[PDB]
Every structure is written in structure tokens, then in C-alpha cells.
């Protein structure tokens, strides 16, 4: 064939820390369908938000929002525990259907997104250029976030994993260091603050 319908930009959702996780890659031929399981960031999360995005940037915020919806009723469980199946399906007329289903509870929500939504030709052309120009920074952003999300989880298990020795003072002190590093944007400072936390958590 010399011509074909593709979806012109990557489509995905926003994941923990403000990142775009892609479900359908740009220039994928339509119709097409892909699913991916996600879970919860923290303990006892009963409600998740599915925020649909079109674009190539690693920062969710830099992509074109296509819509969103909530999925509630999830049994409050430990992080990583819920299995939220996310499905993106683009039919031959270009209509996008997005659904999220929590496997344990059976709770499902969905949204339908008109084919005309999203960025236009010139917009699409900018998006690709701006993504390739910023490839280096988006990648360092994506690492930052992976490092932050680890730091974050470490803060939450270290607080739960607290009679411990009368020395745990320096831990509560190393927690404040880490909580502060996680707010900045220097991947290495965050890991260093984690390293300091491991080294005073030996008695734990």
C-alpha cells in the first residue's frame, strides 16, 4: 500500500511523578489495541485517575490532554497490589476508547474520545521537533522521576519500619534530609540522601 491511516502521535497516560507512559506508539496503524497493567503508588489507595495524553514529551504536562476519568472502589491494599488493566483502542474511524479495570474488584470506568480531538498537522510537526530537541532533558527528567519515586517509597517503608534502639534519632534526621532532596531536581543528591539513610538504618 502507498497510503495508510496511522495515529500520528504516541498515546498514553500519566503515571506517578508526572510522567507520560505510552500505550500506543506514534505512527501505529489503526485500528489498533493495546493493554498494560498498572498498580498503585502507595498503601491504601482506593481511587486512581486515568489522564489520557497525546504527544512525545516525557513530562505529562508538555503533552496534549485528551481527557480523563476516575476509577474508585478499589479495595485499600499495599502498594503494587492492585492490578488496574488499562486498554487503549482506536477503531477504524479514529475514535479512541480508553478503559481501566481493577482486576480484583471488577470495577471498570471508560471514556470515548472523538477522532478530531488532539493536536493538528502543524501542532504535530512542532511536537516531534520539540521532542527531538529536548531528548536529552526529557530523559534526565524521566530518570529524576524514577529516582524520586524510589526515594519516596523508601521514605514510606522506613517510616512504617518504625522498641528500636535509642539511636533512631539520626534516622529521623536522615529522613528530613531525604524528604528535602526529593523536592529538588538533582538525581544524585537524592540517591546520596538515600545512601546516607541506608547507612544509619543498619540497626533496622
Amino acid at each position: 500500500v502507498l497510503l495508510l491511516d496511522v495515529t500520528p502521535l504516541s498515546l498514553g497516560i500519566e503515571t506517578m511523578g508526572g510522567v507520560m507512559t505510552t500505550l500506543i506508539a506514534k505512527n501505529t496503524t489503526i485500528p489498533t489495541k493495546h493493554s498494560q497493567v498498572f498498580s498503585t503508588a502507595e498503601d491504601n489507595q482506593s481511587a486512581v485517575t486515568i489522564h489520557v495524553l497525546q504527544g512525545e514529551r516525557k513530562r505529562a504536562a508538555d503533552n496534549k490532554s485528551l481527557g480523563q476519568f476516575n476509577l474508585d472502589g478499589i479495595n485499600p491494599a499495599p502498594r503494587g497490589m492492585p492490578q488496574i488493566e488499562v486498554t487503549f483502542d482506536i477503531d477504524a474511524d479514529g475514535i479512541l476508547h480508553v478503559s481501566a479495570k481493577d482486576k480484583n474488584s471488577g470495577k471498570e470506568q471508560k471514556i470515548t474520545i472523538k477522532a478530531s480531538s488532539g493536536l493538528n498537522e502543524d501542532e504535530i510537526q512542532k511536537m516531534v521537533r520539540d521532542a527531538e530537541a529536548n531528548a536529552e532533558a526529557d530523559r534526565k527528567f524521566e530518570e529524576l522521576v524514577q529516582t524520586r519515586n524510589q526515594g519516596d517509597h523508601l521514605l514510606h517503608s522506613t517510616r512504617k519500619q518504625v522498641l528500636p534502639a535509642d539511636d533512631k534519632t539520626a534516622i529521623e534526621s536522615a529522613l528530613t534530609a531525604l524528604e528535602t532532596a526529593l523536592k529538588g531536581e538533582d538525581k544524585a543528591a537524592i540517591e546520596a540522601k538515600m545512601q546516607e539513610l541506608a547507612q544509619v538504618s543498619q540497626k533496622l
Binding site: 498498580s39 503508588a41 489507595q45 486512581v48
Partner: peptide, 8 residues
């Protein structure tokens, strides 16, 4: 391994 949705 599964990525995480935003949290509250």
C-alpha cells in the same frame, strides 16, 4: 513490573 498511577 507495573508502573504506578498518580497517587491522591
Amino acid at each position: 513490573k507495573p508502573p504506578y498511577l498518580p497517587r491522591p
